[PDB]
Coordinates of C-alpha atoms and ligand atoms in Angstrom, one line a residue:
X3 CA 121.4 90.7 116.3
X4 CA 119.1 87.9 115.5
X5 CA 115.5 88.2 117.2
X6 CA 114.6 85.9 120.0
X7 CA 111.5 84.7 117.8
X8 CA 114.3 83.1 115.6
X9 CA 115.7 81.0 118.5
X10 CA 114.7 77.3 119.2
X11 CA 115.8 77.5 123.1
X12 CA 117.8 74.2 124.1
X13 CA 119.1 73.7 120.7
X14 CA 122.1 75.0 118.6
X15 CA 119.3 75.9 115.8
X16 CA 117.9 78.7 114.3
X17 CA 115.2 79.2 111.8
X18 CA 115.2 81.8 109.0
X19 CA 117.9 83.8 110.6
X20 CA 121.1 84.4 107.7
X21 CA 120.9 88.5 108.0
X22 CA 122.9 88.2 111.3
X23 CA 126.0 87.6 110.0
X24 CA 127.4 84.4 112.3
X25 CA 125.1 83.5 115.2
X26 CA 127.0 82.7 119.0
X27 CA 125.9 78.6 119.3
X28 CA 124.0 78.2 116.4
X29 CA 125.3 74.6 114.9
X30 CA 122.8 74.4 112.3
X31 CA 120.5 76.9 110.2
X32 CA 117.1 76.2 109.3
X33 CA 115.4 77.7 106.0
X34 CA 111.8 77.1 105.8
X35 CA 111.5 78.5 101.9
X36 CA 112.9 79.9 99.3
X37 CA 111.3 83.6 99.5
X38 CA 113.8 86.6 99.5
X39 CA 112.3 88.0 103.3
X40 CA 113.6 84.4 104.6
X41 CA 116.9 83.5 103.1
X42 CA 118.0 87.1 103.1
X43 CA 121.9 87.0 103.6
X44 CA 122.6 83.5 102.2
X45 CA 124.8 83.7 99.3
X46 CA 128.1 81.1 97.8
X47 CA 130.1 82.5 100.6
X48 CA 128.4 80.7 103.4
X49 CA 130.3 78.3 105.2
X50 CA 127.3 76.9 107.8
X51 CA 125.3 73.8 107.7
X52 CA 121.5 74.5 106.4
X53 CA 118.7 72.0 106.5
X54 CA 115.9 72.5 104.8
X55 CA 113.7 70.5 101.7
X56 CA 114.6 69.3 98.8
X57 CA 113.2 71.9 96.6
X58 CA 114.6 74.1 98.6
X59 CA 118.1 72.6 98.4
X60 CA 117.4 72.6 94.1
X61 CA 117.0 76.4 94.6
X62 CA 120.0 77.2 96.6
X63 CA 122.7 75.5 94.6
X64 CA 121.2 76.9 91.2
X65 CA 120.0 80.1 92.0
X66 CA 122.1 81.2 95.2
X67 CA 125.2 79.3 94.5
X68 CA 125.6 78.1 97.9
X69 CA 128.2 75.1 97.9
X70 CA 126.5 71.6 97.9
X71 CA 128.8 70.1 101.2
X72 CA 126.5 73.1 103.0
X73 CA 123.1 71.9 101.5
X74 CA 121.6 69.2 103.8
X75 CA 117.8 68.6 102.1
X76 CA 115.5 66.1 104.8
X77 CA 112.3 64.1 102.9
X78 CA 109.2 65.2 104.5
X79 CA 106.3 63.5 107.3
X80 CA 110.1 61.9 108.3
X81 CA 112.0 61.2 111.5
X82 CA 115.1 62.7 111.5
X83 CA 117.8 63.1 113.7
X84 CA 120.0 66.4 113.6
X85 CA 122.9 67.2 116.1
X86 CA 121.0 64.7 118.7
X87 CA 117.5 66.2 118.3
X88 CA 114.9 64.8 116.5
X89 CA 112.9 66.7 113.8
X90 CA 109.9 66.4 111.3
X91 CA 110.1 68.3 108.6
X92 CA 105.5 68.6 107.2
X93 CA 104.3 70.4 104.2
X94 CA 103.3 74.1 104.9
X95 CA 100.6 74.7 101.8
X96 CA 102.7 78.0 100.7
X97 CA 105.0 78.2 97.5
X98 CA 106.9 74.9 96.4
X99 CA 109.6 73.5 98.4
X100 CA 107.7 75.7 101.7
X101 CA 108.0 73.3 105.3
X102 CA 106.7 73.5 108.8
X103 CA 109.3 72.2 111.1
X104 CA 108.6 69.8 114.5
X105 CA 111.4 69.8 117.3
X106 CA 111.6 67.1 120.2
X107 CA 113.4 68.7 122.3
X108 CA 115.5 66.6 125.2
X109 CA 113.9 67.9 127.4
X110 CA 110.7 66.9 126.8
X111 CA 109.3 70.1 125.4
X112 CA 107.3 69.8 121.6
X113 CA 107.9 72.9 119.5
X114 CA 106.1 73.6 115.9
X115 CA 107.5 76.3 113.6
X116 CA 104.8 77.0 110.8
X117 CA 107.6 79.2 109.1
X118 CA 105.0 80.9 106.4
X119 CA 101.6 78.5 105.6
X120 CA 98.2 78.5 104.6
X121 CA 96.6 76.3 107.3
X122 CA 94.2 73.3 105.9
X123 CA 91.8 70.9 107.5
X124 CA 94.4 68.0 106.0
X125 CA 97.2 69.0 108.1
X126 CA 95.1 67.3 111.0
X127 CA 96.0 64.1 110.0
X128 CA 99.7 64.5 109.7
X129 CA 102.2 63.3 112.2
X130 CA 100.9 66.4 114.3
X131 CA 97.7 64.4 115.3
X132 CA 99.6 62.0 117.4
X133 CA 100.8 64.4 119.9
X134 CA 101.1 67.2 121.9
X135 CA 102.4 70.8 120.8
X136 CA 103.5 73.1 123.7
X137 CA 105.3 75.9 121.8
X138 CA 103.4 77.4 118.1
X139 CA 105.8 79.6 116.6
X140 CA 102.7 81.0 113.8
X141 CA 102.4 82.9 110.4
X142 CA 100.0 85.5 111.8
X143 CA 100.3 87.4 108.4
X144 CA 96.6 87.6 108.3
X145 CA 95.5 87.4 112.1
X146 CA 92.3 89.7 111.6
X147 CA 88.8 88.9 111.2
X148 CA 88.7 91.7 108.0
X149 CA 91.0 88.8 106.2
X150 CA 88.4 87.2 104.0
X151 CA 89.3 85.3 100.6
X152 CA 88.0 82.7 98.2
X153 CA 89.4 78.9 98.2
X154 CA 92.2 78.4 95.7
X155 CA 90.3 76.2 93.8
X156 CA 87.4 79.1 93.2
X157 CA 90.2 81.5 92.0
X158 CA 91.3 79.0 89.5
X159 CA 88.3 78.6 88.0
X160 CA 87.7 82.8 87.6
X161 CA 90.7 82.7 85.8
X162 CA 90.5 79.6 83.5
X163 CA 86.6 80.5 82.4
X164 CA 88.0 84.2 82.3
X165 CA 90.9 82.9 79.8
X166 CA 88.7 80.9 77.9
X167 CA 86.4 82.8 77.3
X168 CA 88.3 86.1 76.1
X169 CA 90.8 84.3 73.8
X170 CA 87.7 81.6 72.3
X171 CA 86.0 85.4 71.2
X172 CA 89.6 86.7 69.5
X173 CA 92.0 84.2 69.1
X174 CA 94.1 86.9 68.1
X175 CA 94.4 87.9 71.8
X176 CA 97.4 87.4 74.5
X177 CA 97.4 86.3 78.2
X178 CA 99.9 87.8 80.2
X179 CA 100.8 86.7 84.1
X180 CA 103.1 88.2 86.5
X181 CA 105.2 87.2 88.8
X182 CA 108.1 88.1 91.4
X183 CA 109.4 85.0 93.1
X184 CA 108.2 81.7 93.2
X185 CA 104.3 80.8 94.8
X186 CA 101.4 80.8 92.8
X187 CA 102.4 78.7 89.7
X188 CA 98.8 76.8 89.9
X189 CA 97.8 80.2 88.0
X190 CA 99.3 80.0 84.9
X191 CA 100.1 76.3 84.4
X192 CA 95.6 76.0 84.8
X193 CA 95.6 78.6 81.7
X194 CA 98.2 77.2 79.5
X195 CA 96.2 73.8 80.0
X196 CA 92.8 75.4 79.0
X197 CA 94.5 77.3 75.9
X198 CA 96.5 74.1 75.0
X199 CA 99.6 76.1 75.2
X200 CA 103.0 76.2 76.8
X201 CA 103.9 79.3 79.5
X202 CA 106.4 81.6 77.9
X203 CA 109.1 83.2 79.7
X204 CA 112.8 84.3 80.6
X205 CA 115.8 82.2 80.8
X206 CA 116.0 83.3 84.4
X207 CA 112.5 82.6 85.2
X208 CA 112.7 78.9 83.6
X209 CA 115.6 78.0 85.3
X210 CA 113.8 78.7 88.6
X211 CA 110.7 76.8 87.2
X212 CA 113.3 73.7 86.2
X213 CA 114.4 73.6 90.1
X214 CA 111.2 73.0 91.5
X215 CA 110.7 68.9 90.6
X216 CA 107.1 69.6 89.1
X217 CA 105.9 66.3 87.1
X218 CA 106.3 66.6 83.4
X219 CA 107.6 70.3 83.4
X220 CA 109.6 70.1 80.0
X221 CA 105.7 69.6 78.7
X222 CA 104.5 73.1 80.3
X223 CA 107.1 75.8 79.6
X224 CA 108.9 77.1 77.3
X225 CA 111.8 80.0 76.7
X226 CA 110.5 80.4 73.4
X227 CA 108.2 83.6 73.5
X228 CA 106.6 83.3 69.9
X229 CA 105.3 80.0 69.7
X230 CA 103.2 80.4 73.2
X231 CA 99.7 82.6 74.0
X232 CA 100.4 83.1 77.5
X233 CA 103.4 84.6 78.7
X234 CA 104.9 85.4 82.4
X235 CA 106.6 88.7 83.0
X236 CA 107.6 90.6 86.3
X237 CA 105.5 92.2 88.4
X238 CA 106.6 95.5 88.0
X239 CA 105.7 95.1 84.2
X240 CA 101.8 94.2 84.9
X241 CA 100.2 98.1 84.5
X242 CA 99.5 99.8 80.8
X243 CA 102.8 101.3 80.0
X244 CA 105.0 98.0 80.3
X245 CA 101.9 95.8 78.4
X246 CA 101.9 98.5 75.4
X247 CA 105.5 97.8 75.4
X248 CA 105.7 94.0 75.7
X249 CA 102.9 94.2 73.0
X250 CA 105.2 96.1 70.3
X251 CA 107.8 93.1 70.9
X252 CA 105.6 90.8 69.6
X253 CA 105.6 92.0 66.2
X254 CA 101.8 92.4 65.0
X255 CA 100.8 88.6 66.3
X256 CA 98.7 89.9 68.7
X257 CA 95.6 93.1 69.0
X258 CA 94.9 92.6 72.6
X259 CA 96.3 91.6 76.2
X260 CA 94.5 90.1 79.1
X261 CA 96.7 89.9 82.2
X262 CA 96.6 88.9 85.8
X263 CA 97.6 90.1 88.8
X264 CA 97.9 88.0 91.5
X265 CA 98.0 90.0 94.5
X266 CA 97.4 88.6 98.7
X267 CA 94.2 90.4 100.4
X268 CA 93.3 93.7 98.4
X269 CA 90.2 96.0 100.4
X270 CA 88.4 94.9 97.7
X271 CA 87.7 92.0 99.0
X272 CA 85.5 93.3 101.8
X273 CA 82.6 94.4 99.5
X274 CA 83.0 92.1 96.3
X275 CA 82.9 88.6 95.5
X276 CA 85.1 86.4 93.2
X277 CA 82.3 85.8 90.3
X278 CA 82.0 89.7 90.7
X279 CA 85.4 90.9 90.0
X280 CA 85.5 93.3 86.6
X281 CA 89.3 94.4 85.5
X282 CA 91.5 98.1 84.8
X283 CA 90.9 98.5 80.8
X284 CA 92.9 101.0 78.9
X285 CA 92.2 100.6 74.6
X286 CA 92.8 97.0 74.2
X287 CA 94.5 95.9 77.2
X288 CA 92.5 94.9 80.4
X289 CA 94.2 93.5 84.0
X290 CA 92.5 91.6 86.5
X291 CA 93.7 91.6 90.6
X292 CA 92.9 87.7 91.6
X293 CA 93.0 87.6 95.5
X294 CA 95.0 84.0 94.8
X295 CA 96.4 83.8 98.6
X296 CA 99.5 81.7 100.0
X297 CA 99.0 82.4 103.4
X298 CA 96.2 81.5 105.9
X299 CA 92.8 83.3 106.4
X300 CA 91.5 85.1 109.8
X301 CA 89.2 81.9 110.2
X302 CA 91.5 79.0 108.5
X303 CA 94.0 80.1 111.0
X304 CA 91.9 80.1 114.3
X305 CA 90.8 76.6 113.0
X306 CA 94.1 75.2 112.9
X307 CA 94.9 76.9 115.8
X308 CA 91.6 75.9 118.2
X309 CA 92.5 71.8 116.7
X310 CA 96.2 71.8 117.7
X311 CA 95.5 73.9 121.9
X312 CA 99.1 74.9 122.0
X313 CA 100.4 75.9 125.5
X314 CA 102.0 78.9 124.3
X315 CA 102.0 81.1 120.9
X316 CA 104.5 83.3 119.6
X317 CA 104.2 85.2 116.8
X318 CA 106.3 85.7 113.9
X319 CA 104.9 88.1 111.4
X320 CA 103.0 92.2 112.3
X321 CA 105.6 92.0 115.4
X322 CA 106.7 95.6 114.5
X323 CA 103.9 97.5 116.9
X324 CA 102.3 97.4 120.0
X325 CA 98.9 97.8 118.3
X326 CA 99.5 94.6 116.2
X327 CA 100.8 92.7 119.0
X328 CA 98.2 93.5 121.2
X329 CA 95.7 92.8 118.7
X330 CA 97.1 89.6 118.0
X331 CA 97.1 88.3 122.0
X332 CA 93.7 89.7 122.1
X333 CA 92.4 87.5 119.4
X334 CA 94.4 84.2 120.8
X335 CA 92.9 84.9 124.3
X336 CA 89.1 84.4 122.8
X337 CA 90.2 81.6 120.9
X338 CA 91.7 80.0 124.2
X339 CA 88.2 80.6 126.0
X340 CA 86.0 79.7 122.8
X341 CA 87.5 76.0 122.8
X342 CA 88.2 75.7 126.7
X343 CA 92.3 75.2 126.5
Ligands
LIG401 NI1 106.7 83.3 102.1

């Protein structure tokens, strides 16, 4: 049975909500992204109509085989009228093809879905500017002051200058970057670039990549392993035993790995800062954790949240226990009487 933070109430819609089997009024499914926790139950068999991006829409034809009469991809910062309501679809700063979602409801009533995003002083001059919000349905993946972690930009730059430097000292040396769905591709495209190579990797893993309308993509990866320096692998693969292994493949060309591992929030990140981050070294192999984030900060969020005064929050992620939840109300009730709402 689908949760009621799922439901848009006064519509036939639902958001993120395929692991329910078929849902009593629901005329039309929203997907916010393509990551497994959201789209979890959507497969070739379904039979709905689903509205969501156009990257989005790339990835569920090709990698979910969903039939394309199904697939209903909306541009974004656009009017749009579905089943008599009018929507927005806005960009939600997480993986590629990610979207917040606005509903007008008849009624009157403004509701914003953030589905998963990491909250930015830009968004404050989109389409949400011009009006007022009365329901926030919010990402509260990181809703604690403990949540602290670099810009984007400042994680790039460890890793590029990190890169750079290893592989300018042995040029005999191999970068290695994992990965387990999309999000996060900023990592090793900005390492490719300062090695003047192409990223390396599986068939399945390019044909994701191809989906994902990325200017001049055919320039930046490759399936051929042998002829690029920095390779992506799964996840799973990024500790000493699977880099040993992947290193054998490669058939003497290369005497030492540097990989990455980008991770959300890590403890570590309470004590140390980004120039300060030393890696796990084992022989000739060492691995770096990157706190390389998708999702909103403890203070990015109250930001965002203290600009847009929303009547009412609910929200959507740590709903599990009453210690979370009542954490969570606790820190919305001080940001209410901080800015006066
Ligand atoms: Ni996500």
């Amino acid at each position: 049975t689908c949760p009621f933070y799922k439901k848009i109430p006064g519509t036939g819609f639902t958001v993120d909500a395929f692991q329910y089997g078929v849902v009593e009024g629901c005329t039309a499914y929203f997907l916010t992204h393509f990551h497994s926790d959201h789209y979890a139950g959507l497969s070739k068999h379904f039979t709905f109509p689903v509205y969501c991006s156009e990257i989005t829409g790339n990835l569920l034809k090709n990698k979910l085989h969903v039939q394309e009469q199904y697939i209903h991809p909306l541009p974004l910062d656009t009017e749009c009228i579905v089943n008599g309501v009018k929507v927005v679809l806005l960009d939600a700063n997480h993986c590629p093809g990610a979207v917040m979602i606005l509903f007008y409801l008849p009624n009157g009533t403004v509701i914003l879905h953030t589905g998963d995003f990491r909250a930015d002083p830009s968004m404050e001059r989109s389409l949400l500017a011009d009006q007022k919000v009365h329901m926030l349905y919010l990402d509260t993946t990181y809703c604690s002051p403990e949540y602290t972690f670099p810009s984007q930009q400042e994680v790039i730059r460890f890793a590029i200058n990190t890169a750079f430097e290893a592989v300018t000292l042995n040029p005999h040396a191999l970068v290695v970057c994992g990965t387990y769905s999309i999000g996060k591709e900023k990592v090793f495209l900005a390492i490719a670039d300062v090695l003047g190579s192409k990223v390396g990797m599986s068939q399945e893993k390019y044909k994701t990549l191809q989906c994902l309308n990325i200017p001049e993509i055919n320039s930046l990866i490759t399936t051929d392993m042998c002829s690029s320096l920095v390779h992506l692998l799964p996840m799973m693969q990024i500790n000493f035993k699977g880099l040993q292994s992947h290193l054998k493949k490669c058939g003497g060309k290369y005497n030492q790995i540097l990989a990455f591992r980008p991770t959300g929030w890590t403890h570590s990140n309470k004590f140390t800062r980004i120039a300060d981050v030393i890696p796990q070294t084992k022989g000739n192999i060492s691995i770096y954790g990157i706190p390389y984030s998708e999702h909103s900060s403890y203070l990015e969020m109250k930001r965002f949240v203290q600009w847009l005064k929303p009547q009412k929050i609910i929200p959507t992620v740590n709903v599990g226990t009453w210690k979370s939840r009542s954490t969570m109300e606790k820190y919305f009730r001080e940001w209410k009487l901080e800015a006066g709402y």
